[PDB]
Design a protein around this nucleic acid. Structure first.
Length: 178
DNA sequence: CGAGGAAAATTG
DNA sequence: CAATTTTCCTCG
């Protein structure tokens, strides 16, 4: 259900998420698109801050979404939707649709305290029945209503070594019945 | 306003 | 048949 006790670290640098949301996101449907977005049982929007690269060179962070499978990940289902609310502090946020995969290329400014708060992305539920007739693909069919987040950064050091990171956020789950 | 809970439909 | 889902409803 959660594995936050076994980090890999990146030398003298460390890219980790600050305030973490709950694993019970509320993804609505394309037929009832109205509510459902970035929130938690009470209050705890997700935050992403890098504490390591302290050079005058800029950096670009990318997001990699992958369903909550067992060992090898699968091609993301369809958790792709926009948002709307003055509280949508889009200081650092971006999206990138891929062949059955969703990614977010969020760049980091130079001296902006390396801040990247997440409060401008909602969540849509993937109608399993619609993904059942999909055939071939192994996206959210009918027994997998859970996806996983994988944050990855890539900052090349001007000397002889690349600084790449890979974090894993909690799996998004809309089904309430175990 | 959002979210959760419950209800329900359909599919396997 | 039960599994699982689906969408709604109600509620905070």
């Amino acid at each position: 259900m959660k594995d936050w006790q076994l980090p890999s670290h990146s030398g003298p640098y460390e890219l980790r998420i600050e305030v973490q949301p709950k694993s019970h996101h509320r993804a609505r449907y394309e037929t009832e698109g109205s509510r459902g977005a970035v929130k938690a049982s009470a209050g705890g929007h997700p935050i992403v801050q890098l504490h390591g690269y302290l050079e005058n060179e800029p950096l670009m962070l990318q997001l990699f979404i992958g369903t909550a499978d067992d060992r090898l990940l699968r091609p993301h289902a369809f958790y792709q939707v926009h948002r709307i609310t003055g509280k949508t502090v889009s200081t650092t946020s971006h999206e990138a649709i891929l062949s059955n995969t969703k990614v977010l290329e969020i760049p980091l400014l130079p001296e902006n305290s390396m801040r990247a708060v997440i409060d401008c992305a909602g969540i849509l539920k993937l109608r399993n029945s619609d993904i059942e007739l999909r055939k071939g693909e192994t996206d959210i069919g009918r027994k997998n209503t859970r996806v996983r987040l994988v944050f990855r950064v890539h900052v090349p050091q001007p000397s002889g070594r690349t600084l790449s990171l890979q974090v894993a956020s909690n799996p998004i789950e809309c089904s309430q019945r175990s």
